[PDB]
Symmetry: D2
Subunit: 334 residues, 4 copies
Amino acid sequence: GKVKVGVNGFGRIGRLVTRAAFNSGKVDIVAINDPFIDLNYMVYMFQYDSTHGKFHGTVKAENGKLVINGNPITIFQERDPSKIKWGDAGAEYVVESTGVFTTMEKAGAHLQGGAKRVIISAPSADAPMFVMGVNHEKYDNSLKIISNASCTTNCLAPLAKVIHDNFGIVEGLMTTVHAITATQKTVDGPSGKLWRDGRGALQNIIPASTGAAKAVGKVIPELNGKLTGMAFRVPTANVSVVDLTCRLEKPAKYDDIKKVVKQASEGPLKGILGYTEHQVVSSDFNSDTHSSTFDAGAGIALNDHFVKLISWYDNEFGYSNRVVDLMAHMASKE
Amino acid sequence: KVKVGVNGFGRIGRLVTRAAFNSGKVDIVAINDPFIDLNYMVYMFQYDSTHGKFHGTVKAENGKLVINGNPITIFQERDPSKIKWGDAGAEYVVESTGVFTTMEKAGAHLQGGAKRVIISAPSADAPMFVMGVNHEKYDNSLKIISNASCTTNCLAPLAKVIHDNFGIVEGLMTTVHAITATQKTVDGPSGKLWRDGRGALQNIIPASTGAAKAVGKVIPELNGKLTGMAFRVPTANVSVVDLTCRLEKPAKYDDIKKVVKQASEGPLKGILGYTEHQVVSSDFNSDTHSSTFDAGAGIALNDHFVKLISWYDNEFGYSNRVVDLMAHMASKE
Amino acid sequence: SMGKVKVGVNGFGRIGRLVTRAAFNSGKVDIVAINDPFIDLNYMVYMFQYDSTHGKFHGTVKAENGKLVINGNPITIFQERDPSKIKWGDAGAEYVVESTGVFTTMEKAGAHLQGGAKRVIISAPSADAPMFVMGVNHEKYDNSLKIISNASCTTNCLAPLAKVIHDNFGIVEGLMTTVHAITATQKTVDGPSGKLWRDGRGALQNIIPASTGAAKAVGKVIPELNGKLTGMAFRVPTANVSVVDLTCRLEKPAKYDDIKKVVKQASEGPLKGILGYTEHQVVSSDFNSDTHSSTFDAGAGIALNDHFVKLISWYDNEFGYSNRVVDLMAHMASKE
Amino acid sequence: KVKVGVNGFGRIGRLVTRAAFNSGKVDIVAINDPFIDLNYMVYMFQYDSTHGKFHGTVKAENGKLVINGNPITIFQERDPSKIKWGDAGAEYVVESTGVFTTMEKAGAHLQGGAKRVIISAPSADAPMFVMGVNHEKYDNSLKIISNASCTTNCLAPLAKVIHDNFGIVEGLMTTVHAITATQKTVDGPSGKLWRDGRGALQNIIPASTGAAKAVGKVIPELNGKLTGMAFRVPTANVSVVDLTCRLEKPAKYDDIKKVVKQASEGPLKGILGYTEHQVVSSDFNSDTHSSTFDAGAGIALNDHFVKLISWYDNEFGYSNRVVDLMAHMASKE
Ligand SMILES: NC(=O)c1ccc[n+]([C@@H]2O[C@H](COP(=O)([O-])OP(=O)(O)OC[C@H]3O[C@@H](n4cnc5c(N)ncnc54)[C@H](O)[C@@H]3O)[C@@H](O)[C@H]2O)c1
Ligand SMILES: NC(=O)c1ccc[n+]([C@@H]2O[C@H](COP(=O)([O-])OP(=O)(O)OC[C@H]3O[C@@H](n4cnc5c(N)ncnc54)[C@H](O)[C@@H]3O)[C@@H](O)[C@H]2O)c1
Ligand SMILES: NC(=O)c1ccc[n+]([C@H]2O[C@@H](COP(=O)([O-])OP(=O)(O)OC[C@H]3O[C@@H](n4cnc5c(N)ncnc54)[C@H](O)[C@@H]3O)[C@@H](O)[C@@H]2O)c1
Ligand SMILES: NC(=O)c1ccc[n+]([C@H]2O[C@@H](COP(=O)([O-])OP(=O)(O)OC[C@H]3O[C@@H](n4cnc5c(N)ncnc54)[C@H](O)[C@@H]3O)[C@@H](O)[C@H]2O)c1
Ligand SMILES: *[C@](O)([C@H](C)CCc1occc1C)[C@@]1(O)[C@H]2[C@@H](CC[C@@H]2C)[C@H](C)[C@]2(O)OC[C@H](C)C[C@]12O
Ligand SMILES: [Cl-]
Ligand SMILES: [Cl-]
Ligand SMILES: [Cl-]
Ligand SMILES: [Cl-]
Ligand SMILES: [Cl-]
Ligand SMILES: [Zn+2]
Ligand SMILES: [Zn+2]
Ligand SMILES: [Zn+2]
Ligand SMILES: [Zn+2]
Ligand SMILES: [Zn+2]
Ligand SMILES: [Zn+2]
Ligand SMILES: [Zn+2]
């Protein structure tokens, strides 16, 4: 009954999707491809995690396979995704978590080796994009190549849904203060396409472009063209925050806003959108599996139509859990 | 050159003194700090993790601190009232401690025979200035005055240009702020401000700030039209303001760029910077601007609703302003 | 006569909170009272519940009827600056953990006896109290000793390793560096530290050399090494976990594989839980929340020759030490 | 002044260039990087998170990089053997890419008409030099050489003074070293060196290093008598050496201080520094010494067994030594 899954790119997201799948039992990981991490290295990289701690389970190399909690995983080492024998390994869905194959054309290479469906762990220029709790019911069986959007979109869209559903968003500008990621550099280094992203990640606050707010208008079509934003990368290793400045169509007191977010967090968006009035800081959300946790005490309203709302997200662990949730929902529809 | 005294030799005290000797706009003659003896003052002024070693000379001679060959008198006097300023020849005096922010508690410097007191911080009830915005509203009647905060000094110059040209209907500000001395290394006690106790290396920390409201006190027309909040992040210096605002008259982003650029080259030269370069925070380390507009970092949704980004070295910009203020108060004497 | 000793904690800080956490996790002692004039009851709930380094408390914690209630156990809360005025006896606290950092002499720590505590355990080195390292000299504790010290995090890392090396090969002389995480004594940005100037400098920006008596202290808990060790520290910008680097000359020849064998044997037997052993390609975060006093890193050390070696051992300076405070108190209880 | 080509405009190539223009000791006339276009070189050279904005001018002009008014020929060759150094007039080439560290690979620059190559890293086969210690062993027969590492350049000058005066029987070195470009921001792949893949911001990371053993090549009397290891820690620049050594002759700590201080003022001036100040790592940012002995930080167990501490700006000290080595080579012809 559980869908069998293959992971392309055993990185932060590849490893934590694997970790999430084994922790939740919602899907079964049967194959991993990563040309830059051999089998014995995968054991080490999966077992020890600077951010989320040692894996709670067993991992070893046995008979040329990676065995997680007694479950053997076929390991591939292919640079070219069209050459990965997913079908032979029994992988039905492929998580595409390399960062380099994000178009439907590129991600579609996995169909050549026998995958049935591909879930891109990032925004896509052209794939249908999903955020669990917001538009995952728009998924249908005709969609072989889909995107789970970004961490930032998965934080903003559940909050935006609640605000838009209750009061309407006329227009919104978003900032995300975002943890450093593997794309950044330790010291000033080369990033020919994006100069600021080459600058030393430990030393700097680094402004960066993001399509994450615009993307919310693709997962919530009524908000198409009504949102945009940007990011600052800062020197923390995990956990990020969204700051949405928006104008509301209908007036809302800040306590009205709190009430509808809290109600959504306790009912239909349970496990997706969280709600806190605690005096939280970023490390309080390390390994928190929500997509989005609204911080009641941190936001501020100028008036009943113009507000700044704050939501936290563990950019690694919330998203990884969402990738697994999406695949479980896809499988239920087969 | 007016002759100046400093109460506290903390980051602002030291950096005002540094700015005073580097600019040569004013001239320091006295300092007071109980948690800090003369020999220790030499070391704290000479070496600085953030801004580097002082360019010049500093020594203890005859019980005075001597900077670039200039003797300075050193009080230890635990109570501001008890501060023999006039003795030392301190015309104006900078209140850098920030537990004497009110006008009464900081009136105390008048008791010691000091003429006029520039406070290095927001005040509940004193007249706040920001150079380039409302300093031309200083006349001689004024004693205890405020130079506002670092963040207000970043936000107000940009707000002035944007309001002057397009009108700000309303705005909400975020500052992403480097760590400060009020934060803790590891989770520790901050009983009035619990989030501020949490370890500063490990955390993004949301914080209240009155800086955006305060803009409405130096720019009366923006009173009640701005508020905001902050995030403390684990960098050692240089902060950024993110102002999201709704404009009355429509403005293409290229028009916003044009007016900010004009202002930076003209009347706000030295105060409001303008760049289109692909900058990051450390590029503004020891930059003496109040506010530098980052053209490439900002983003418009439409002609009425825009997000504008401005950098400030929270330590250094402000310190230079406190000196600039005194040079300008000296020309009004 | 004495069963599970009841404990009071003076100073609810990193160590006071994590000793509390260790006591509830291990069950070895019962925390019945806490004193901190800088953290009121509602604030204690928050500071205990959420921890940047070690994560949310796995249990329940709340305030009710003026008590702190942890895992349903009510704890009496005091707010006294002067330790002679804390009513430990009325609250049922028998041993007191003196974890403020400002009462480390037998005379200052002994203030707790005035309010009815029976014994005091100073969570730091002491100029005059008997000092103990679990696994090394705790069996030298006797019930005549009412005020004692559990030494420092660093001494608890070095001593168990120094014991094994000395016992097997003989240490002629040794010099130790500890590369140590930042602590609450340091500053976020350059600020005043009148007696220790370097310690005022910004903790996030700098490597900061600091004196430490931790190596010299090993010669007090292992008398045969008296005057044979000393060392120093560098503070670096990590929030927790530290490492000891011991360079020593050995009396008998020791191949590195022999050193590894005897450490592994000690870690598996008499020093189990105290001294660990690994050959894994570890880094500091791998020991976050690790309860060992000392984990020998086989791959990180290096021998110049059979008599001159550099040995590396990791320690969670918060969590290893806090567990050791609990362990020592339960040992003390067993000897009443 | 000898004319110099720089292969690779990473951190070393950039700071060698900066050292060259700052000191004036050599004339940079060409730079090769296949990966980094001219406009991007301007940006990478002008702005530096660690050392600040370049003190001077830099611009693109007529297809050349122009620094302080000096045009520099820019190449974009993947294959070192194809770089036309001769046509650009580059006599010596600094091989700073990190991937051409053997004599076979480094020697490709000679095919394009370079006369000598200086590898800005340890080499498995090129002779290694440390200025102040064995640079007088350089001779005109040596067409391809190495300037060793930043750590060897720190340890060797201190080891030389101690050995010369007291004799080193045996020594073990630890270096607590700032992060570098080879590390990762979060846990990532490093297949030959698993610990070095782990997040550099989060971790103390132990690493093997031949830097201490290498001292036995530049000081042959110490062959087999020194080794050590490194800890990478989350600071962005400046490192420190901790040398634990047994001495043949007795030495009071105060005798150690005297001989290091004399060395710092005489033959090793500018190379080996000496301080009794209460320094921390940031006090050495942009310091051009190879090695600064920290008198206050070290400790003696006895007259024969000591721990000595010496700071080094791994970037700036080393880059200045590459320039100084080239000036010394130029002095021989
Ligand atoms: N905070 C986050 O990291 C985050 C959150 C949500 C989504 N994502 C997205 O998920 C993707 C991966 O994110 P990440 O942080 O884990 O980066 P990452 O660098 O850790 O992932 C790359 C991994 O895939 C492997 N890989 C690289 N090229 C490959 C190839 N050609 N074939 C197979 N494997 C290859 C890498 O060696 C590495 O193990 C990115 O698109 C990223 O933006 C990231
Ligand atoms: N890595 C470590 O933190 C570590 C490891 C081993 C031992 N120790 C030792 O344990 C002691 C505490 O270490 P720490 O890191 O937790 O420091 P800390 O600052 O976190 O502990 C101080 C706590 O006690 C409270 N306190 C202060 N003065 C008090 C008083 N007069 N009465 C009652 N309570 C008071 C503080 O408000 C604070 O809550 C120190 O001596 C320290 O060196 C610390
Ligand atoms: N001893 C060795 O065997 C060895 C091995 C690897 C690296 N290294 C050396 O690297 C040194 C300096 O490092 P850094 O901190 O400046 O690193 P860096 O990454 O900042 O500089 C490397 C630069 O070389 C450039 N580069 C890469 N390939 C190139 C090519 N084919 N042609 C021209 N340029 C190219 C890159 O653009 C990059 O900017 C030392 O760490 C170390 O000595 C040495
Ligand atoms: N409105 C506000 O936001 C607010 C609130 C409180 C304080 N403050 C002030 O506090 C300062 C913080 O800036 P900082 O970086 O200089 O902090 P800081 O900690 O470095 O400044 C304190 C310095 O003054 C010295 N000092 C302390 N008490 C003193 C006294 N009674 N008399 C004389 N000197 C004393 C300190 O020992 C220290 O050297 C102001 O810049 C300002 O922020 C402002
Ligand atoms: C220094 O820093 C060392 C050698 C890095 C690693 C190391 O430290 C001690 C022992 C080892 C093996 C450098 O690599 C510098 C590099 C950039 C930063 C980095 C820390 C400088 C500028 C360097 O010159 O590159 C050449 C080299 C091998 C050494 C180097 O100094
Ligand atoms: Cl865990
Ligand atoms: Cl309009
Ligand atoms: Cl936990
Ligand atoms: Cl400079
Ligand atoms: Cl002797
Ligand atoms: Zn309305
Ligand atoms: Zn300077
Ligand atoms: Zn004027
Ligand atoms: Zn022997
Ligand atoms: Zn026992
Ligand atoms: Zn001196
Ligand atoms: Zn010479």
